[PDB]
């Protein structure tokens, strides 16, 4: 098939900025290029067809240009309801192929996380596993580092992380990290801690507990 490569994959901008998204095809597609907007839990919306024609009812701040193998979507003055994911799609050839998408997120000021640590519940320990949970609440930008330490020993390979989308009210993120151990490995150690590194923190914040409310 014809492979479509969008760039960038993610973008942070502020209201009023000028935004430009590029799409490259692996061979010529003439002008048979479309751009779509998708908000989460919404159907994709057609913005631009045949490379530069605006779809009926789409703000004239959206425009597109290009032919051949290189194409551009441009938003002249970025508005609030334009933070979304944007896909290009070629229809020169079957199979039709979408680009991988470009997420346009909102820019805002640094905001350091509030950090919280949760020991494993007794109920889960009866079942033979221990999950330790570290919460980073309401921070910006998305980049954060979480390091688990057990009796001061760095851990690796035994945790997983998940991050929210940008909050609708304040444009921050939250992140949850889970350390999983067997009950046996959990009771072999005393001090459990997550160390958080982030831009809004002058130095790393550590939260910890001692097994057995100590």
């Amino acid at each position: 098939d014809i492979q479509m490569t969008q760039s960038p994959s993610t973008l942070s901008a502020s209201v009023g900025d000028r935004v430009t998204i590029t799409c490259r095809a692996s061979q010529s597609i003439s002008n048979w290029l479309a751009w779509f907007q998708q908000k989460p839990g919404k159907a994709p919306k057609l913005l631009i067809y045949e490379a530069s024609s605006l779809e009926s009812g789409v703000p004239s701040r959206f425009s597109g240009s290009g032919s051949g193998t290189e194409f551009t979507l441009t938003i002249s003055s970025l508005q609030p309801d334009d933070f979304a994911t944007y896909y290009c799609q070629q229809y020169n050839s079957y199979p039709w192929t979408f680009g991988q998408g470009t997420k346009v997120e909102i820019k805002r000021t640094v905001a350091a996380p509030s950090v919280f640590i949760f020991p494993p519940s007794d109920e889960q320990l009866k079942s033979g596993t221990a999950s330790v949970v570290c919460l980073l609440n309401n921070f910006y930008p998305r980049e954060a580092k979480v390091q688990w330490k057990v009796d001061n020993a760095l851990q690796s390979g035994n945790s997983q992380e998940s991050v929210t989308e940008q909050d609708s009210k304040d444009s921050t993120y939250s992140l949850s990290s889970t350390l999983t151990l067997s009950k046996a490995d959990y009771e072999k150690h005393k001090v459990y801690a997550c160390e958080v590194t982030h831009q809004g923190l002058s130095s790393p914040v550590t939260k910890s507990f001692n097994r057995g409310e100590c």
Binding site: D1, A34, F36, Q38, K42, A43, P44, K45, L46, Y49, Y87, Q89, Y91, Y94, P95, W96, T97, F98, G99, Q100, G101, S114, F116, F118, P119, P120, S121, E123, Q124, S127, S131, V133, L135, N137, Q160, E161, S162, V163, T164, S174, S176, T178, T180, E213
Partner: protein
């Protein structure tokens, strides 16, 4: 008006087969080309297949050529996708889509049906409290760990909908066991733990599981 309804999604062991269907009303289905499109969890849209009104052609994405079959029954106003030799990487929400013209328009997309391909088996979640710990003032975090379920999704509410401010429910992660885990948290005034009840409501329709778990500080 115009609506498209997928059905037939569920769970599938690798190498096996599943058949999807989509029913159409509010437009002249017998004269429209019809497409399938899928979207894996928080990944991009991927075009799957298309068939014209008369079936005279059938085109397929490269990744599904030889394993998938698209077909239609204009009589019933319905579209089918037959999927065989399914692989983990076919896990996605599958949509039917069409158009009053040539290109996709948001009016003509279905709601989607999830398909999960995995050696894991349907399993309901275990719900564990994430208990909060100064309690005279400040902010307390509390939540629920919804662990070892399959397939997606679960829903989590708090106090039966009456607590929405400050709630973050995180996207599930796939553990190496093939089972999903997620967390749901809320920040509250720490002094509220003395007067207020916090219960998370968890639902896993695929396993008919419904749990209400009260989340309290642990006895010092």
């Amino acid at each position: 008006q115009v609506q498209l309804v997928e059905s037939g999604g569920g769970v599938v062991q690798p190498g096996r087969s599943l058949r999807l269907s989509c029913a159409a009303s509010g437009f002249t289905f017998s004269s429209y080309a019809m497409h399938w499109v899928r979207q894996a969890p928080g990944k991009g849209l991927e075009w799957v297949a298309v068939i014209p009104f008369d079936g005279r052609n059938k085109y397929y994405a490269d990744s599904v050529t030889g394993r998938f079959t698209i077909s239609r029954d204009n009589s019933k106003n319905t579209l089918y996708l037959q999927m065989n030799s399914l692989r983990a990487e076919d896990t996605a929400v599958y949509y039917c889509a069409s158009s009053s013209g040539y290109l996709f328009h948001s009016d003509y997309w279905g709601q989607g049906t999830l398909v999960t391909v995995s050696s894991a088996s349907t399993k309901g979640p275990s719900v564990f409290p994430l208990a909060p710990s100064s309690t005279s003032g400040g902010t307390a975090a509390l939540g629920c760990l919804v662990k070892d379920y399959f397939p997606e999704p679960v829903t989590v509410s708090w106090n039966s909908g009456a607590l929405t401010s400050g709630v973050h429910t995180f996207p599930a992660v796939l553990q190496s066991s093939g089972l999903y885990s997620l967390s749901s948290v809320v920040t509250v005034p720490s002094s509220s733990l003395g007067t207020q009840t916090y219960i998370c409501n968890v639902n896993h329709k695929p396993s008919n599981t419904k749990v209400d778990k009260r989340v309290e500080p642990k006895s010092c």
